[PDB]
Amino acid sequence: DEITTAWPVNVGPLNPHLYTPNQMFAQSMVYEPLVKYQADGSVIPWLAKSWTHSEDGKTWTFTLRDDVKFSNGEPFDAEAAAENFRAVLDNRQRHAWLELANQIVDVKALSKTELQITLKSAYYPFLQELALPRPFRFIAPSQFKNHETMNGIKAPIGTGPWILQESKLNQYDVFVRNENYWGEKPAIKKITFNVIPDPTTRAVAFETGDIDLLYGNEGLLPLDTFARFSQNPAYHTQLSQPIETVMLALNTAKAPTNELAVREALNYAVNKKSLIDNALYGTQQVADTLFAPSVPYANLGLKPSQYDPQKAKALLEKAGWTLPAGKDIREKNGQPLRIELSFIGTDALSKSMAEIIRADMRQIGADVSLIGEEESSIYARQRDGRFGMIFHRTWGAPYDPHAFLSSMRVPSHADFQAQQGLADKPLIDKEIGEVLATHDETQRQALYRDILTRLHDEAVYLPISYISMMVVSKPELGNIPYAPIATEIPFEQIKP
């Protein structure tokens, strides 16, 4: 049994150690990690069968399976593992975004079955970052070019359950089952991805039966089409639990968003449910908090700001943003309450949301300008702190919360810049450093509670909605599971 699906672009060459144009879901189909991420925020053995612990906190010895073969029959060895780590760290600077890349001090193969990795310091998200789709997974060293991968590989030969069989630029990628896989055999023997750039066209492909499956985030197919599919009993549709937050980041370094009372009022001003019914076709849940309570360490009981334009208006009045008789926009010492909202001008969902937000904020006295620009101009805006408000999102499992929070500490970025007006920013950054290094469960939770609580209570963000993974499927395919890792698709778990 066989399936046909769609993707906007080709899968890429599937170099397991590089980024764009390689597609993450496809790298995860073919290549495998030492240890596999779990929904709760923990890991299980995978290519490594077991491992040991702290010499200092920062040396680890993995005991590897001995029955695993690459898809060409060549053997998976700790030597092959060590070769992959070397090829990756040869290109260290490219993986700097990722603290493991920085952290790792040495990788040496002690024996065919034992592999030793040493760290700079005790970095609790170690295993979860080993478990990521890239870059720490394993290609046959025979496929290195001049003893490296950083400049390309020959054939994408992994140990995983799927093999990339055939590729055609802008047309398709075909994968086949690895009949020599070390674990459970997939029930599907072939998966063909038609390259279909346009979301409507993808929807039409599913309707006509040209494709069996769509599995994806909010850009997967038009959201009104999903809603309609979901009412049609010829179709199987599903929405996962929250996987990522969409929110505004508010610039606490620039008036007027530097006022706590202004951020509080903005947090009462948006009717999130109406925005979700109207713009998102009910595909997302209301977000009351930076992180969904189902995110590791974030089940904190933080109080939501309900939709309450009355409470907003009173805050602004009290902060000196007074509503003149006969006028709709408030003013403080002669200056109209204006706020600039920056978004990427070709992103339709972002544009539609931003229009809804302008109208809701006008009802509380704030005139919101909408500035839609090309992606690159928005990225500059983030780096520079040149914005009032901006759409923003968390990063998905397994990054949240530890990675999203780590990144706030970095001066060239939107969250570091937007947070410069917070009296306690240096304390929040220090506590983030601390949480990433801590080993005690309780202290870890205590610290995240503290970090997330300050960001809630200081109204740093305006959470809007949580994205759900969307599935549209032929019923014959049955129930479709969700991968713990947000960008993976569990093709290996589909049983018609």
From Swiss-Prot:
Gene3D superfamilies xrefs: Dipeptide-binding Protein, Domain 3, Periplasmic binding protein-like II
Subcellular location: Periplasm
GO biological process: negative chemotaxis; nickel cation import across plasma membrane; nickel cation transport; peptide transport
SUPFAM superfamilies reported for this sequence: Periplasmic binding protein-like II
Pfam families, sorted: SBP_bac_5 (PF00496)
UniProt GO molecular function: heme binding; metal cluster binding; nickel cation binding; peptide transmembrane transporter activity; transition metal ion binding
GO terms for cellular component: ATP-binding cassette (ABC) transporter complex, substrate-binding subunit-containing; membrane; outer membrane-bounded periplasmic space; periplasmic space
Keyword Isomerase recorded: no
InterPro entries in the record: CntA-like, Peptide/Ni-bd, SBP_5, SBP_5_CS, SBP_5_dom
Keywords: Nickel, Periplasm, Signal, Transport
Top-level taxon of origin: Bacteria
First-listed, main subcellular location of the protein, grouped into a coarse class: periplasm
Role this protein plays: Involved in a nickel transport system, probably represents the nickel binder.
Family: Belongs to the bacterial solute-binding protein 5 family.
Protein name (Swiss-Prot/TrEMBL): Nickel-binding periplasmic protein
